[model samples]
Target: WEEARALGRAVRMLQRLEEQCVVSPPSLRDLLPRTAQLLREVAHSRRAAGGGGPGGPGGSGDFLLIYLANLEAKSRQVAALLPPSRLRRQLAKLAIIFSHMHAELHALFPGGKYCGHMYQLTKAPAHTFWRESCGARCVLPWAEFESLLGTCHPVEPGCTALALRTTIDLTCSGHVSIFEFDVFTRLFQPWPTLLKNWQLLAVNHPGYMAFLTYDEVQERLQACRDKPGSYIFRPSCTRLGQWAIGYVSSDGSILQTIPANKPLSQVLLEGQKDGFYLYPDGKTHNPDLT
Candidate 1:
């Protein structure tokens, strides 16, 4: 409890610094301890809850939060020091890369064809559309392989795509929040109405804020408001976003509405119902992956 209270104090300090958008090096330095403290508190509380003590999971959610916060800080630091024109050009290049990724996905896994064969799935649609959408990298169907090298396996990687196979395997079994919430942590989004709603809920409901320090809790609420643009990554109102959400709902932000032509079996194949619909053709999005 004493540790929890200390965390609350640190969180409050961090909140004030973030809300004010402290640019001075001295100001930031002064607040660094609180920021650090908040992260530690998150760890301490998680430990108290029976995680990462000894024979525990060997992982801490608090570390995830701190890493994300540091990532955001690094981005801000770079932006502050770099030229605006350079940043603009860099951004344009990124946009082009993103467009290229979409085009490649369309060419490789043409959603309209919907192939039943795991490898040639683009030609024919399968029931597990949602899982494929959420699953990153190559959109290989997981059920294709049951045994590999004599052991039972869940997925089959057509020999030769070792790198891809490894990435896919790890991504599927790795920490869920790493991609889901990590994106939010890495970048400090200034203010969004949706985030504000989450904040209100976090504060008004004690159950919601149980793990967070009071100040850290407050910072989380205010983080969205600090984002430079109203929407991060692609604009929320884009046609692509609308089209993607039509398939899988992301983070309770959207509701899925499958087409009449698509089979019902294909719809239920999508993994957990939660997550944002990303891209025009039924794909799930994690900010880190994007």
Candidate 2:
């Protein structure tokens, strides 16, 4: 098993050396002897098993000829395809030039006026700059985001489309929020801080109920399924800039409206003190904290 694993890893390295960029191909002398020893060990194992060859179900005796055929084929293919030192220099030159071009392109998005009207990015044509810190903000639609990548960095053509397909929307807020955009294109956008430094603790805190809608907050509270001391903190839908703590103050789902005004760290500390460990994360108020 160990020999097989080592051989598999070496074969993987052989394939990797082909696809990945490199300087002068290193001497495989160090790699070759170790590989031969492992291959011989595999042959010894085959002899001990005395199993039929890989040719067919009941084929007779076989050594490592077929194996060598594949190995030598890969070796020769790599040898033949591998660029000479002169060609290597030229290929390396292309990458550096490509990188220089990217440096220039990233500069364009930061300060371009869109349609001679609004201050905007060329592809991400939204006024993402100088936005307010709090309250609900708009997002760049997936359509615009697609165009943004397509126009600005269309090197790997389908990568942006695949990025859209694979994005895990934690909030299920289906649009390219500026926070999400900054994560990809580090154009240093002056992003609105809903989920920003210190403020993000609200969501990260275990006591805080991040996903539940106000409707669900009411639904679960009315359900009255859990014990006392259990409470929830959710953003106020109507008020827009406040978080409210809910509890079973109701004979039904009694949601206690303790308005959230303090820092989230303090809120978490207070919540831990006042039996707000509704979610099963930790017991103590403070441990490894920021």
Candidate 3:
């Protein structure tokens, strides 16, 4: 019974996305043909299972029949959203970027993202700017993630997961691969606060930076017309940006931008231990940060 409700929610969620124009509306029949048929078959066979028939209000057979009937009653509108040829490859790249964000955040704490049952970020950044209080490592919270996605894509506050899932599913099934690449360009767009500081949340996360290649970064910098000698720092990977970061700065300085699908090392120069600090002396380095 609970499982049925959960599946019902999934169906409704997909329907909501369709109504929102997030994905090409696909029918329940088209989306889960085999599974729907299997449910119908089991409903048909329920007579010999020593169970109540399809008319009963609470049995599996009854539920399946009701679900299938609902789908059958609905007419298909708008052609199926065929998967775009490159959605899978593109979404795979997006997933990898997300994973890097997760890993980079985890690496900050002594025992990783969680210390026992609690997150160990202690004090995390509220914006994309680099802060000494963040302890030379980047951090992001679930709420911040939600806000960032909404800010970049016009997505409603609660729909980030829906957008992500729909994109992945469309990639898996070409019939639904109809999203515009405009959202992709917005992937690196700076938030208001980020623009003010000439920094980006993407740049703060090393895993994200590692995902881009130098050529990719250079291209974005050129497109944005950033001058040479601009930089961004990636604390998680212990790297320092030179010439270009992921995006270009408003002032033609080192700017934060989206990463390209390239080797991680190509993004920037690796730094030494305790690299966040300015040199205290000509020869002596800070030992406390390491």
Candidate 4:
């Protein structure tokens, strides 16, 4: 528990530093014990002399905190004036994933015609006159679409398919082709939302914010002012398993837990029923593989 707490503390500190553009914290590979040692020396040196050249705001000690804050504000000034590249880089990576899938589908059929035609699915339309217009475009039915989704995205393919399936252009048909799904997904969104959740599932990623005590969880949720989607995930602290979701509602906060017996992806996916989402925000999301 103590180790996890310190890891969260350091990780959050690293995240703040990353946001400031003053340092690259995610690249910080660590032996937590040694980091604690550096933290102590860096901390104690401040008490040796709280004087000139290294003085903190209002003559504060804890030289480390003061120094971290000291340089960060200047970069905030620099960062505010600059354009953002992080998002651009993220978008570029996704473009590569989609590029491969488009290749896979076309090569699998080896013909352009099979890939683009729209099908009139059974659930979609009911009209005797409209039945005449149809061709088997290279579109994958829900099953095939899912297999494609399985190729590129690592999240649970079931949830991924369900989320993207809703974004399909109903006019085209019940099934969606690669270009069709890609185009809709482009403006259709949740691409970033889906990708962000991917990072959240990675235990090392900074956004998960997994260290808050159950005590802190209640206070933050209560403070959310009845905003229902504001949520937090605790890596431990529940009877159920490795993760627990803390949520806010009109009644206050609630503890809903997670166990690997149930993957976290399904928990977030099932949230469509209640509109729960990744803590602090929500948007279009992902598909499944496992």
Best TM-score among the predictions, by candidate number: 2
Candidate 3 clashes between residue pairs 3 or more apart in a chain or in different chains:
81-175, 81-176, 82-174, 82-175, 83-174, 83-175, 230-254, 246-257, 247-256, 247-257
Candidate 4, 147-244: lDDT as tens digits: 54544443455655454454342212344443444333322123434444444453322224432445555665666545656666644322212455
Runs of candidate 1 exceeding 4 Å displacement:
1-57, 61-265, 268-290
TM-score of 4: 0.27
Q: Tens-digit lDDT track for model 1 on 1-290?
A: 44345445545544544554432111333334434444454535444444332221212323233333433443344335443356543433322222222222233224322111222222122213323443322222333221221131122246423422322231222222222222221111221222332233222222121211222323343343332111112211112111111222223222324223322212222322332222222222212210
TM-score (all chains, Cα) for each model:
0.23, 0.30, 0.22, 0.27
As for candidate 2, its clashing pairs are 221-253, 222-253, 247-256, 249-254, 250-254
Model 2: weakest 10-residue lDDT segment is: 108-117
Those runs of model 4 whose alpha carbons end farther than 4 Å from true positions after fitting are: 1-207, 237-241, 278-290
Model 2 scores a C-alpha lDDT of: 0.37
Worst 10 residues of 1 by lDDT: 235-244
> What would the per-residue lDDT of candidate 3 be over residues 150-234, giving only the tens digit for each residue?
5443344345444443332212221111111112222322233322122222322322333333444444346434333333322
Q: Please give the TM-score that candidate 2 achieves against the real structure.
A: 0.30
Q: Using TM-score as the measure, name the better of candidate 1 and candidate 2.
A: 2
RMSD of each: 19.4, 24.6, 17.2, 22.8
Identify the runs in model 2 with alpha carbons over 4 angstroms from their true place.
Answer: 1-211, 222-226, 249-253, 258-260, 275-290
